[PDB]
Amino acid sequence: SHPAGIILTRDSYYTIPSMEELARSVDENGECIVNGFTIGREGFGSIYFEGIVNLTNLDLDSIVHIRRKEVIVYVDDQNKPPLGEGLNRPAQVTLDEVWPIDKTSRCMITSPERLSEMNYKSKLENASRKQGAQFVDYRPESGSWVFKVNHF
Ligand SMILES: [Cl-]
Ligand SMILES: [Cl-]
Ligand SMILES: [Cl-]
Ligand code: NA
Ligand code: NA
Ligand code: NA
Secondary structure (H helix, E strand, O other): OOOOOOEOOOOOEEEEOOHHHHHOOEOOOOOEEEEEEEEEEOOOEEEEEEEEEEOOOOEHHHHEEEEOOEEEEOOOHHHOOOOOOOOOOOEEEEEOOOOOEOOOOOOEOOOHHHHHHHOHHHHHHHHHHHOOOEEEEEEOOOOEEEEEEOOO
């Protein structure tokens, strides 16, 4: 019903504070509450939640999915807590390797000069804007698209 502990077991996923540190961070009431929380996945991206976040017994393996050019936080609208609770709250998403594909070669375009010339960053920025997100950055070296959302 209410099994104890944060669940995150999948390869290349990590938290900040680390899972080791979060296990040491349960308070006298039984809650794990941190000031600033990141969940990331090496090679794919990360999600930073500023402020006071209650992580108590969260099944991050079920809730969080950091994929190529996509994150999913709560797979089913029906399992999502009210706004402000859990991870359904403002966050900064970083997606790595957001590079366009050359349509002739079907290889990714990673040249910063070619990306600048086409102003690829502005394509990502307008996509963020039209989705109601706030564009933060596009770092061409790593293909890192950074944007803020108000919730998931
Ligand atoms: Cl916990
Ligand atoms: Cl980051
Ligand atoms: Cl490629
Ligand atoms: Na997996
Ligand atoms: Na990615
Ligand atoms: Na981020």
